[PDB]
Amino acid sequence: YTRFIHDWVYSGVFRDAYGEFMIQVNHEYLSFRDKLYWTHGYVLISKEVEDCVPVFLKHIAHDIYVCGKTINLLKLCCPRHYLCWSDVPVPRISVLLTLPVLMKRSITAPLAAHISLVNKAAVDYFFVELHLEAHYEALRHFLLMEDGEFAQSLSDLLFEKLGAGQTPGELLNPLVLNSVLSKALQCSLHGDTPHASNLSLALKYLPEVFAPNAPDVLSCLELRYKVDWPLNIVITEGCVSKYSGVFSFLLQLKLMMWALKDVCFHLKRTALLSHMAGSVQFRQLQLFKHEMQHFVKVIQGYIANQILHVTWCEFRARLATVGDLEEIQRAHAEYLHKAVFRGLLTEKAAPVMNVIHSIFSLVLKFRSQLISQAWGPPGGPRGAEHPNFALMQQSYNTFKYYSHFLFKVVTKLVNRGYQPHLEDFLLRINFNNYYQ
Amino acid sequence: FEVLEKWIYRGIIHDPYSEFMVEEHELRKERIQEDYNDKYWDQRYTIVQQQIPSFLQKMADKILSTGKYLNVVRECGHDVTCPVAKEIIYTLKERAYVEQIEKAFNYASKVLLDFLMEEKELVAHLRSIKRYFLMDQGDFFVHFMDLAEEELRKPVEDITPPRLEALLELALRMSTANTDPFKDDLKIDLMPHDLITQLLSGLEAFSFDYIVKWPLSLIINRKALTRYQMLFRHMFYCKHVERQLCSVWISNKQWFAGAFTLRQRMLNFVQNIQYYMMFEVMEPTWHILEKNLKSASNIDDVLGHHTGFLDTCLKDCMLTNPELLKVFSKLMSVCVMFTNCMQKFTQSMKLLVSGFEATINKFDKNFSAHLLDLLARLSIYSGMASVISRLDFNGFYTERLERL
Amino acid sequence: RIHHDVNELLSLLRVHAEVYIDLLQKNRTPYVTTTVSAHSAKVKIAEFSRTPEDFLKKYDELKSKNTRNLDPLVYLLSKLTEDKETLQYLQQNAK
Amino acid sequence: TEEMELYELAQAAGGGIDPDVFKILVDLLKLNVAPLAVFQMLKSMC
Amino acid sequence: RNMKDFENQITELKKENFNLKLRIYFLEERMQQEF
Amino acid sequence: RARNMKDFENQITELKKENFNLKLRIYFLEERMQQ
């Protein structure tokens, strides 16, 4: 077992024939990407559920296997800055009584120091041979839109083509979609750098039909970062699933920001070109849109806090703290889990996300009806040329009701449970009083 | 390992009892210059796959491909050698002495292409092919299909090759061959079996053969030079058919201008697709070819880079198309009539309000129907997508029978 | 390279879409020798104890033969766990 | 089959395959194939 | 179009490569006769 | 499972570069010997 330790700690191999050691190997070992690396290993922490405590302890048997991965498989994918093929200075094994159990382990325990060094010499492959977290910034730039000039070029192209109509799914063709993705990527101005490579679209059950105002309210517009093997130890399927989830949820928020442009452009569109005639439906309706834009924009500022520094700024020190692959994977999983939990998207806060949909749909379906119409009844301080002005008013009353309902509802979660981001929310959205 | 050493650092096969992993046979005579089929891996030079150890088999292709670079240009005129020489011997749990193989392979690659790229220079020599195919030595070809045009143009055989063989000298010296005298590789070739080898006269009149001596023959070989020998012929007919249509336009520099406008319009269908076919991707493929080959240096990738480059240049030319774009071939049968029958009419109009006109309606919706469906037929792509984008561009007749 | 005789014909020879995708699934690399076998796979013949002396004696003779093809037969010694899903077709084929 | 390692090894313990397919699988060991991939491609269709 | 017609055409183009492999299989066995 | 809508471009030029090459060439490996 001193030799078998060495084989798996100073080599990456394991001399075994009878199962005399608890290690294993698989057909997974012979392409060894992805989950297949998450499968090559050892059968349990023990053999069945017992172990020779004098050497494998049932304790540090894990950290043994951490360096086991670090020494076996880093060179296996690609010869490595501390191993070459296997030609770093050639391996050697290491490893009536007045200390009976007390210090058996203390003979073997300098192995754990070697392990801790191999561990410290595992972090660099991801920090530089990948530039992993520099790409996390790039991932935040593109997928989490902190490069707002990419994200607005994407929004401008995609939602200009979507606000042109094409309501029986007729925009969703591979070639136009790729052209806007590509074009948005060319217009990013950060450039298609090595970090800013690897970008692809996605969707599932591409809709042959759209709702009114063309929202894609079932958000089947998506973005993906193509993942390299050594990236794909720390990048992971559920992580990119949750990433594209928040991407699609913020992207429909960018569609509501685009709606914000469109409804304000409806003012500029006919410019109230009758310069000489002030209008009450102007002073009314151009203030109706003011609360709706103020509202969706304070929700925007709120969510921009909840992920892009409320959840990210802690991760900027949390990733710098750690020193293990599994800690790096786990800390990335913390960051993403808390991003879904704080950024409203979680299944537990979903009752409030339902009110968000109730607001969104109303603003979509009632300002499309403005977009396709002019400016109310003539007479007095007047606009002209739409009859449905009372329905534009009553839908704005329905919006206000759902904002009243929102305030009544959101208190409940922070009175029952414990979610500081929802206190933060209702502290903000009706800042000065019960409701304005 | 001493036998391996001789083969890795020199072009010498020591051959102990033929138990070493590489041996040489005299297959050289089967395909001496070009790799007409492969020779230098299993055949003339051969690897006995089981005679390699484990720690060397992981790169025994590079062992087999190191020494060849030291012993193919030794016959051609440079002493290709490795002054690096690191002795190979066993050691406990070590194979750094096999890690030396990469440096020696890359050095053999370096001295081989340090010949090939600049003595018998491929980066300047190879240009000859795509320069002379697809009429890119334009100052030759404008003279070529002009001085002897009257005995090249003819509808069914009836060329006189000796005339263009004298023009091949005058019109090349009159062109740019004065920039570099690289003419001798040009030889005329003609059809054994029509289209499919490519992978009427003036129409598709001829195409040009290409063979070279050994180090350039790593690059020029049968599977490639059959894309030489018989290509650009499916491009030559366009320039013939439009210039012959235009010779009708010479014979008249009443007069219902719809006929004149179709003469312009059907010609533009030739002219702008001819623009697309070759006046599209030009610089990039050369910029790629450099940074591909000049950095790599090693035939195991160099031939892949080159054969990739060759198809990349062709992918403008719808000469390369799996559907043969075959309605365009049917359209061609009336296109030639727009030349010959209307040349005949530019006598019989007195020997255009009538006998042109009675075919203008026919040519018009013969071309405009098939033209505005076949681009949609080729709607494959999501420098590319150029054939479709470039006759979408007009806006009227963007399509008439759509893909979607 | 030569996938006609041992991949295309072997895919066509099966008695049972993945008609052309089975060759891409079994896309072998000719430059490799990476067997996934181990010494633990030698006990696969112990389940077929109809005559286990002349079931255990064969492996040393096959190793003493000068062919290096005995290594990839670790999964092939276990073969199919379904009840005679390859072996019973020969009795139908012999008729 | 018609070989000492193709035919004798195919009927050692329990035995039994198609003979041509067994000869093709015995020849596949010399074709440098990964042991799991060809058996998985056979088992995903059979 | 329903995001399976295009991939069915792709699988047809894989079947084209399989047909070319079958033509290669007939070609490399006809090589032995007269040549 | 989910489809990224860009790999089909590479797949199209891959099948084009394999199949149209092989289709015309393999048949005219006859012509090299028959002609």
3-state SS record for chain A: CHHHHHHHHCCCCCCCCCCCCCECCCHHHHCCCHHHHCCCCECCCCECCECCHHHHCCCCHHHHHHHHHHHHHHHHHCCECCCECCCCCCCCCCCCCCCCCCCHHHHHCHHHHHHHHHHHCCHHHHHHHCCHHHHHHHHHHHCCCCCHHHHHHHHHHHHHHHHCCCCCCCCCCHHHHHHHHHHHHHCCCCCCCCCCCCEEEEECCCCCCCCCCCCCCCCCCEEEECCCCCHHHCCCHHHHHHHHHHHHHHHHHHHHHHHHHHHHHHHHHHCCCCCCCCCHHHHHHHHHHHHHHHHHHHHHHHHHHHCCCCCHHHHHHHHHHCCCHHHHHHHHHHHHHHHHHHCCCCCCCHHHHHHHHHHHHHHHHHHHHHHCCCCCCCCCCCCCCCCCHHHHHHHHHHHHHHHHHHHHHHHHHHHHCCCHHHHHHHHHHCCCCCCC
Task: Collect all residues with Cβ–Cβ distance below 8 Å to A94 and sequence separation of at least 6.
Answer: A2, A6, A10, A110, A111, A114
For the beta carbon of residue D29, count every other beta carbon within 10 angstroms: 21
CA distance B335 to B265: 12
- Expressed in Å, this structure's resolution amounts to 3.6
Of the candidates A19, A125, A123, A36, which has an alpha carbon nearest to the alpha carbon of residue A78?
A125
Q: Which residues contact C34 (CB under 8 A, 6 or more apart)?
A: A30, D34
Chain A contact partners (≥3 CB pairs within 8 A)? B, C, D, E, F
Q: How many angstroms separate the CA atoms of E13 and F15, rounded?
A: 7
> A86: which residues sit within 8 A by CB, 6+ positions away?
A75, B93, B95
Q: Give yes or no for a contact between A264 and A271, defined as CB atoms under 8 angstroms apart.
A: no
Per the structure block, which two tokens stand in for C56? 């255990």
Residue-wise burial string across B198-222, b where 16 or more C-beta atoms lie within 10 A, e elsewhere: bbebbbbbbbbebbbeebbbbbbbe
Query: Which DSSP category does B270 fall into?
Result: H
CA distance B312 to B315: 5
How far apart are the C-alpha atoms of B183 and B212, rounded to whole Å?
13
Determine whether F6 is exposed, middle or buried from the number of CB atoms within 10 Å of its CB (0-12, 13-18, 19+).
buried
Instruction: Let me know if chains F and E touch, i.e. at least 3 Cβ pairs under 8 angstroms.
Output: yes
Report whether B231 contacts B328 (CB < 8 A).
Answer: no
Among residues B55, B64, B78, the alpha carbon closest in space to that of B7 is found at B64
Report how far apart, in Å, the C-alpha atoms of B397 and of each of B285, B364, B382, D14 are: 31, 12, 21, 73
Give the distance from residue E26's alpha carbon to the nearest chain C alpha carbon, in angstroms: 9
Q: For residues A116, A117, A122 and A127, what is the CA-based torsion angle, rounded to 10 degrees?
A: 110
Within chain B, what is the greatest distance between any pair of CA atoms? 100
Helices A325-342 and A61-77: crossing angle, nearest 10°? 90
3 state DSSP class of D19:
helix
Tokens encoding A347: 């299944």
| Chain F residues closer than 8 Å to E17 by CB | 15, 18-19, 22
Amino acid symbol at B162: P
Q: Do chains A and F touch (3 or more CB pairs under 8 A)?
A: yes
The whole-angstrom separation of Cα B288 and Cα B293 is 8
The answer to whether A143 and A223 are in contact (CB under 8 A) is yes
Give every CB contact of residue A432 below 8 A, 6+ residues apart in sequence.
none
Structure-block tokens of residue B302:
């160099």
Smallest Cα–Cα separation from A402: which of A371, A356, A346, A334?
A: A356
Residue B302: helix, strand or coil by DSSP?
Answer: helix
Q: Would you put residue B47 in left (φ > 0), alpha (ψ -120 to 50) or beta?
A: beta
Please compute Rg for chain F using Cα positions: 16
Inter-CA distances, A364 with A358, A391, B294, D5, Å: 10, 14, 57, 74
- Specify whether the CB–CB gap between B338 and B245 falls below 8 A: yes
SS3 assignment, position B155: coil
Within 13 Å and on the Cβ side, how many CA atoms surround A429?
28
Of B395, B398, B330, the residue nearest B367 (C-alpha): B330
Q: List beta partners, residue A47.
A: A50
Q: Is B85 helix (H, G, I), strand (E, B) or coil?
A: coil
* Phi-psi label, residue A377: left if phi above 0, alpha if psi -120 to 50, beta otherwise: beta
Decide if F35 touches B, using CB distance below 8 A: yes
Q: What is the DSSP string of F4-35?
A: -SSHHHHHHHHHHHHHHHHHHHHHHHHHHHH-
Token representation of residue C72: 């990839």
Q: How far apart are CA A359 and CA A349, in angstroms?
A: 16
At a CB cut-off of 8 Å and minimum separation 6, what does F24 contact? B196, B197, B198, B199
**Under an 8 A CB cutoff, do B322 and F6 touch?**
no
Contact (CB, 8 A) for A180 and A158: yes
CA F30, CA F35: separation in Å to the nearest integer? Answer: 8
What are the distances in angstroms from CA A132 to CA A328, B30, F24?
Answer: 11, 53, 46
User: How far does the CA of residue C79 sit from the closest CA of chain E (Å)?
Assistant: 28
The CA distance from B319 to B273, in Å, is 11
**Closest Cα in chain A to D40:** A27
Pairing mode of beta strands B22-24, B187-189: unpaired
Cβ-Cβ pairs closer than 8 A, A with E, add up to 3
Q: Which chains touch B (3 or more CB pairs under 8 A)?
A: A, C, F
Whether B171 and B182 have beta carbons less than 8 Å apart is answered as: no
Contact list in A for residue E9 (CB cut-off 8 A) is none
Which residues share a beta bridge with B188?
B208
Separation between Cα atoms, residue B257 and residue B265, nearest integer Å: 12
Specify whether the CB–CB gap between A293 and A256 falls below 8 A. Answer: no
Tokens representing residue C85 in the block: 């899903």
CA end-to-end span of chain E, whole Å? Answer: 50
- The separation between the first and the last C-alpha atoms of chain A, rounded to the nearest angstrom, is 74
Torsion over CA: A242, A243, A248, A254 (sign)? positive
Give φ, ψ of B391 to 5 degrees: -120, 15
**Contact criterion met (CB below 8 Å) for A105 and A99:** no
Give the pair of three-digit tokens for residue A109: 């325990």
